[PDB]
């Protein structure tokens, strides 16, 4: 028996080669690895809490846009329509 | 691109062929028609590739081992073959065998006429090869001679593609012996590409393929050919490809 | 032939050095035999066997490669006039233009040989160096590979006080006369210097503009063509396109040298 | 065994960059400039350094300037500087 | 990097010196390069035409060679921002060349992924030696891919048998394939003689595969029982 | 994604260029015994052969056996690797 | 001209694009024209390419971006094992054809999509393949299971009559390591270009 | 007549031993198909001849290397210009007493 991190499972419909069995390969896999990126105002979304919590941090502060990794106008509108939000009830 | 050698007295051999043994159209069929198809088979096969450099020969001794890509080998292998085919035929570039050519067939069957020698070749191209093939006269690293056949275009170079007998037919118990011995010997190879070590050398190439006799000596008579064949051929060729 | 060849018996088999020897003689005689292969390129063919300045076309130097620039972002603008257009990211040397500063260079390089100037070959690149090495046989010239230790031409008595100078016919006969210390210190300067990557020695092209000496140089689309007497607009980065280059050079100069040679003989 | 500095100067560079001596001694004349002592605040203390810059030149339009420098006496300093001149002559239209 | 005046004036510089007598003998250039001239004409030559396509780089369309009215049907009566601006920077930036046949290989091999499998030599050989008479797909000197099908499409364009682009490339992609199809039925035919005539092969493809393969697990399985102990303790 | 380019620095290096080798066979061996014997009482004998092969492991040396060009290639291909423009 | 030489010419017949080189993603065909040289071209560094390639290159097939960057190198990865899949393919004989009743498209504005197979096979359904031993019925294939079963350069589903534990249970996740045998069904190929094999192990 | 330099190395960096390395290249090249089946002058002594004071360990090191492979030509095939070359870079017992016992 072994665990599951030093083990690469190849899909089903996928080629591979003989380095993809290697450990070298699963270290690459590591190391290389939505609505609003969709395109549309993030301003719509206030109403709409369980959507705008997925930009959030488990605590409450919104991320950023080198985490987000959003447009920096869709970032600060979809900051804005957080600010909204919390200042409603609702979020 | 691979192109066919000028012959010397080309212009001569159109006119004529060759004295004996093949006649103008005949020649034609076998060399100034066939060989040129041949060449541009190879060149269309191996025109991007890497192949396209080397010589037939080289090819040949490149790709032997490669299951896949055997159609390269057998053009590869057919134009070397009826090059020496053909140079062993031309009549100039009268000659007799060698002394030490004799001296050397002598030591290898056991001490047999150079007659008899050649009576015993056209018997084995009767028997062996079904079809097309060829018939040479080969030298190994033991230095005494014997005859191969190959079955269509066979090298007689690398033994695995020796193509020396038809498993499409029946074989007998020996014959699968040698196979299995032979097999034993490519996996005991231990290389990447698994190329075993070979030094066999032509001799006498003679061409059983349609492609020389039939014209001239119809459907039958190959024999016929083949014997007249050994009777006119340059043998100051033959002494060159013989001496270490 | 083979003198230390010992030959093994009549009823032993084939020796190893003897098996060698026959599969050479085979090679040399029945190998190279079912075809003949017309149209395809050798590299070691363009070293031995290059082309004269005038047998030279367009189409030629596109096949070595010449026409192939540097890159978009690594432009020098300097280079402007040399270059034909842009495509797959990358400044394309117009090749007419390198055609016909080939050819100055090549008639300059073929004037000096004649002169019985010496002419020196810089390519500090990895492969450039048996290439160079070749040029420099042809003509009777110099070469460097090892790299460019700053000062040769203008601190010359420092760096090359120690080595030995020669005599020379108007032949290139060594008659071999004692040279006088006064006469072995002078500095021998080329007259030519002929460099396959300028912009890796900045260095060379500096002091022969300091120390007076006309230069060639193959300017890529990001090399300042001002820094040397004839530049050849090219692609300096492939091995081959400059053994082209360098192999034309080479061969207009041994032609010079024949041509002077001739004259003297005369 | 043991003007002449001069000579010596043009011998030099002669040596060094194939210039004819002969024309360096005659025809060359020099001409100081500019003669500063100099120094340099080292950790071993002020260390000074004589500076010269001397133009020579061919009155037929040939003109050089050169600048030396010595920690021992002048005479080497100016020596340098005429050196560098005559490295760097120049025809002036 | 500023415009050198000192490398091309070399021979001016020592006809000066060769004048004063600092220079008592001539090098063996000094004739040479007299004889043949440098450049020393560093300039910014502009250009007309981008000569991949042949547009005309200079020309403006004026407003009386646009008579009729333009999309969303506005006649156009005025010169526009752009047709103001001075675009000298466009006569002298060097030209994007672009060909039809790009579009043509991008297709190609989006409809024909595998076809990139084939390895491509890119080492020229003489590209004036060549002939190819594109009536059909095999030539001597070039082997069978995606560029011989998109010449072949060229040529049929050219000659105008199928006036259409895309109808033309279909034609040639379809004279591959059968072409390709006998190509795949030579080698294995090939294979099926050599096999019968007792040929022998002693590594197979597969085979080699999974020699390759075996070498890389076995790496990994020393590799990760050290990674495991790593991991207990 | 947002490229980050540098300005010309005087010279690319790290640090400390870490050469991450592996653990100690000695201390692995150590940590499961205390790892045994926090289980299973002071000292049974499931963790037997386990202390053997502690003791032959640390009998000449408290440790059983005892770097990464890295910058030397960063100081090699600064040069190169710059988007540095023309002289 | 020049231009149209250029257009002709073999850096202009690789077709451009600047997919990534590390792709860790799925990979169910090739992503690069994949590139070899000659011996003598390689022991010279000549890939037909801008620049020389480093002499640590010791490979003669690569596979690449862009001809030259801003960083002074050609972005590329000195490897070709799509065509060694190929070629495996090949080799197993087993000819790819529609589940789906539909005419081959082989035979008779643009469409992007695969035409077909993406030509790995260019192979017809109906033949059948001759030995010494006889006609070959059932295709034997060495592989390697996982967990799915690598066989020849693709995964493929597997079946079988029972499930063997010995092999299985006496090396849970290290069943990679043995080799076993297989009986490949049919090849079927989806719209993303993926190859659907099938296997049966053999024992 | 006219004063020139002897080697056609003269402006590079050690000239002496690169053009002692090019007569080995040029050996090796011409009997680079010779099949292949120790005392070697130092460091010290080929600096003499060599390069001197510019000589480096590198270009010793592939020096060594160049005479080496050619003197592994099997002796059998190899010429007298390549031995010729190589040629350069060559170069108490205590018993027991009368009566039988060792002193020490
Ligand atoms: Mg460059
Ligand atoms: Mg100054
Ligand atoms: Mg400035």
């Not at chain 7, 000549?46 to 690569?62: C, M």
Request: charged share 25%; net charge positive; proline share 6%.
């Amino acid at each position: 028996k072994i665990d599951q991190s030093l083990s690469k499972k190849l899909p089903k419909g996928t080629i591979y080669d003989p380095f993809d069995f290697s450990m070298g390969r699963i270290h690459l896999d590591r190391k290389y690895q939505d609505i609003m990126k969709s395109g549309a105002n993030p301003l719509e979304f206030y109403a709409r809490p369980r959507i705008l919590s997925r930009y959030v941090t488990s605590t409450g502060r919104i991320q950023h846009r080198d985490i987000t990794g959003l447009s920096a106008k869709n970032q600060r509108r979809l900051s804005k329509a957080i600010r909204r939000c919390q200042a409603i009830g609702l979020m | 691109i691979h192109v066919v050698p000028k012959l010397p007295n080309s212009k001569a051999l159109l006119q004529n062929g060759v004295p004996n043994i093949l006649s103008s159209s005949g020649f034609k069929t076998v060399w100034f028609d066939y060989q040129r198809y041949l060449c541009d088979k190879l060149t269309l096969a191996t025109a991007g590739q890497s192949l396209e450099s080397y010589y037939p020969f080289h090819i040949l001794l490149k790709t032997a081992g490669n299951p896949l890509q055997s159609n390269i080998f057998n053009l590869a292998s057919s134009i070397h073959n009826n090059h020496l085919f053909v140079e062993n035929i031309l009549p100039s570039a009268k000659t007799e065998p060698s002394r030490l050519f004799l001296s050397k067939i002598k030591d290898s069957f056991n001490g047999s006429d150079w007659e008899v020698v050649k009576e015993e070749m056209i018997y084995r191209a009767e028997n062996e090869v079904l079809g097309q093939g060829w018939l040479f006269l080969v030298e190994n690293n033991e230095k005494k001679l014997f005859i191969l056949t190959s079955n269509n275009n066979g090298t007689p170079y690398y033994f695995p593609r020796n193509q020396s007998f038809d498993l499409n037919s029946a074989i007998s118990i020996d014959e699968f012996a040698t196979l299995k011995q032979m097999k034993e010997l490519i996996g005991k190879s231990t290389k990447l590409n698994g190329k075993v070590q070979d030094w066999t050398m032509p001799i006498i190439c003679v061409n059983l393929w349609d492609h020389a006799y039939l014209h001239d000596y119809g459907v039958g008579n190959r024999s016929k050919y083949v014997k007249n064949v050994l009777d006119n051929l340059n043998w100051s060729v033959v002494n060159n490809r013989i001496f270490s | 032939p083979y003198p230390n060849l010992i030959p093994s018996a009549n009823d032993k088999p084939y020796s190893s050095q003897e098996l060698f020897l026959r599969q050479l003689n085979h090679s040399m005689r029945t190998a190279k035999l079912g075809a003949t292969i017309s149209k395809v390129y050798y590299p070691h063919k363009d070293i031995f066997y290059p082309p004269l300045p005038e047998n030279i076309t367009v189409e030629s130097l596109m096949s070595a490669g010449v026409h192939l620039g540097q890159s978009t972002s690594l432009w020098r603008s300097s280079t402007q006039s040399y270059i034909y257009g842009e495509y797959k990211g990358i400044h394309i040397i117009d090749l007419n233009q390198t055609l016909s500063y080939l050819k100055r260079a090549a008639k300059v390089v073929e004037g000096v040989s004649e002169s019985g100037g010496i002419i020196l070959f810089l390519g500090t690149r990895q492969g450039q160096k048996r290439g160079l090495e070749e040029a420099a046989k042809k003509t009777h010239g110099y070469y460097v590979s090892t790299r460019w230790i700053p000062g040769t031409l203008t601190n010359s008595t420092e760096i090359s006080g120690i080595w030995e100078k020669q005599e020379i016919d108007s032949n290139d006969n060594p008659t071999e006369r004692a040279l006088s210390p006064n006469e072995t210190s002078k500095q021998v300067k080329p007259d030519l210097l002929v460099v396959l990557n300028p912009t890796e020695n900045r260095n060379a092209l500096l002091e022969a503009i300091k120390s007076r000496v006309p230069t060639i140089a193959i300017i890529d689309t990001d090399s300042e063509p001002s820094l040397v007497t004839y530049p050849i607009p090219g692609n300096d980065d492939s091995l081959r396109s400059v053994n082209f280059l360098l192999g034309v050079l080479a061969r207009a100069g041994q032609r010079g040298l024949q041509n002077r040679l001739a004259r003297n003989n005369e | 065994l043991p003007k002449s500095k001069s000579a010596d100067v043009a011998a030099g560079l002669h040596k060094q960059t194939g210039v004819d001596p002969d024309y360096i001694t005659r025809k060359l004349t020099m001409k100081p400039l500019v003669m500063k002592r100099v120094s340099n605040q080292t950790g071993k203390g002020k260390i000074a350094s004589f500076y010269a810059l001397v133009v020579v030149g061919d009155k037929n339009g040939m003109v050089g300037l050169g600048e030396g420098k010595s920690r021992e006496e002048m005479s080497k300093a100016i020596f340098k500087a005429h050196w560098d001149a005559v490295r760097n002559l120049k025809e002036i239209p | 990097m500023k415009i050198q005046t000192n490398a091309v004036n070399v021979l001016q510089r020592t006809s000066a010196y060769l004048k004063s007598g600092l220079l008592k003998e001539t090098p063996a250039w000094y004739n040479v390069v007299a004889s043949i001239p440098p450049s020393t004409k560093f300039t910014r030559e502009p250009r007309f035409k981008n000569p991949s396509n042949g547009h005309i780089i200079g020309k403006l369309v004026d407003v009386t060679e646009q008579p009729h009215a333009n999309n969303k049907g506005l006649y156009k009566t005025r010169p526009n921002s752009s047709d103001k601006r001075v675009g000298v920077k466009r006569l002298y930036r060097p030209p994007k060349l672009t060909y039809v046949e790009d579009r043509l290989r991008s297709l190609f091999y989006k409809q024909h992924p595998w076809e990139l499998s084939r390895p491509k030599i890119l080492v020229e050989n003489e590209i004036g030696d060549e002939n190819y008479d594109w009536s059909h797909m095999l030539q001597i000197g070039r082997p069978l891919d995606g560029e011989s099908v998109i010449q072949r499409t060229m040529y049929l364009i050219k000659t105008k048998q199928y006036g259409d682009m895309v109808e033309a490339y279909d034609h040639a992609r379809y004279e591959f394939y059968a072409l390709r199809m006998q190509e795949e039925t030579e080698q294995q035919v090939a294979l099926e003689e050599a096999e019968m005539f007792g040929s022998l092969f002693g590594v197979s493809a597969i085979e080699h595969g999974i020699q390759k393969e075996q070498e890389v697990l076995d790496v990994w399985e020393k590799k990760v029982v050290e990674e495991t102990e790593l991991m207990a303790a | 994604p947002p490229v980050y380019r540098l300005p010309p620095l005087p010279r690319l290096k790290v640090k400390k260029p870490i050469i991450r080798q592996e653990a100690n066979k000695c201390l692995v061996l150590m940590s499961n015994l205390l790892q045994c014997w926090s289980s299973y009482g002071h000292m049974s004998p499931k963790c037997a052969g386990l202390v053997t092969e502690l003791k032959s492991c640390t009998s000449e040396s408290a440790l059983g056996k005892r770097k990464s060009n890295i910058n030397y290639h960063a100081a090699r291909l600064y040069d190169r690797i710059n988007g540095k423009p023309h002289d | 001209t020049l231009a149209e030489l250029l257009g002709r010419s073999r850096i202009a017949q690789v077709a451009n694009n600047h997919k990534p080189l590390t792709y860790t993603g799925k990979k169910f065909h090739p992503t690069h024209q994949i590139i070899e040289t000659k011996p003598s071209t390689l022991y010279r560094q000549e890939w037909g390419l801008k620049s020389a390639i480093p002499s640590k290159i010791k490979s003669r097939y690569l596979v690449y971006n862009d001809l030259d960057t801003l960083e002074r190198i050609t972005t590329f990865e000195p490897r070709g094992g799509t065509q060694w899949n190929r070629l495996r393919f090949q080799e197993m004989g087993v000819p790819i054809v529609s589940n789906i009743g539909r005419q081959n498209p082989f035979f008779k504005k643009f469409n992007t999509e695969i035409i077909g197979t993406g030509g790995l096979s260019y192979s017809l359904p109906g033949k059948l393949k001759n030995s010494p031993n006889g006609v070959i019925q059932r295709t034997v294939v060495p592989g390697r299971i996982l967990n799915l079963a690598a066989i020849g350069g693709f995964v493929a589903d597997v079946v079988f009559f029972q499930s063997p534990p010995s092999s299985f249970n006496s090396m849970g996740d290290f069943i990679r390591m043995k080799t076993f045998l297989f009986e490949i069904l049919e090849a079927s190929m989806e719209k993303n270009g993926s190859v659907s094999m099938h296997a049966r192990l053999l024992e | 007549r006219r004063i020139v330099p002897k080697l056609a190395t003269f402006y590079s960096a050690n000239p002496n031993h690169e053009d002692r390395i090019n007569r080995l290249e040029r050996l090796l090249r011409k009997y680079i198909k010779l099949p292949s089946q120790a005392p070697w002058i130092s460091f010290d002594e080929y600096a003499l001849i060599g390069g001197g004071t510019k000589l480096k360990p590198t270009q010793y090191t592939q020096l060594l290397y160049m005479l080496n492979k050619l003197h592994n030509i099997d002796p059998q095939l190899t010429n007298d210009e390549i031995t010729s070359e190589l040629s350069q870079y060559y170069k108490k017992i205590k018993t027991l007493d009368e009566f039988g016992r060792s002193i020490a």
